[PDB]
């Protein structure tokens, strides 16, 4: 168990408070649609024209 824990390095912190590390995703994203309307203002159903 020590030879398993001798495989890991050690960072010397400054305090004994809790510590943080920032994680990030991407910037590029696709946005879902919630509804669409034609020019007169009424929403387009699934059984509608072009």
């Amino acid at each position: 168990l020590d030879t398993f824990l001798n495989s890991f390095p050690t960072r010397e912190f400054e305090d004994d408070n809790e510590y943080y590390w920032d994680v990030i995703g991407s910037s590029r994203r696709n946005i879902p649609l919630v509804e669409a309307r034609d020019e007169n203002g009424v929403v387009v159903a699934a059984n509608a024209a072009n």
Partner: protein
């Protein structure tokens, strides 16, 4: 811990020397020096 230094020179092989360097990355206190944070506050 720190590898056995009291060896013959033939058994101070390449993984023995590597275990000593690998130790330094895994663990400061000195008896006549101030702490680094005390010196860096001075600087």
């Amino acid at each position: 811990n720190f590898p056995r230094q009291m060896l013959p020179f033939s058994k101070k092989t390449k993984q023995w020397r590597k275990d000593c360097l690998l130790w330094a990355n895994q663990k400061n206190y000195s008896l006549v020096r101030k702490s680094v944070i005390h010196k860096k506050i001075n600087y």
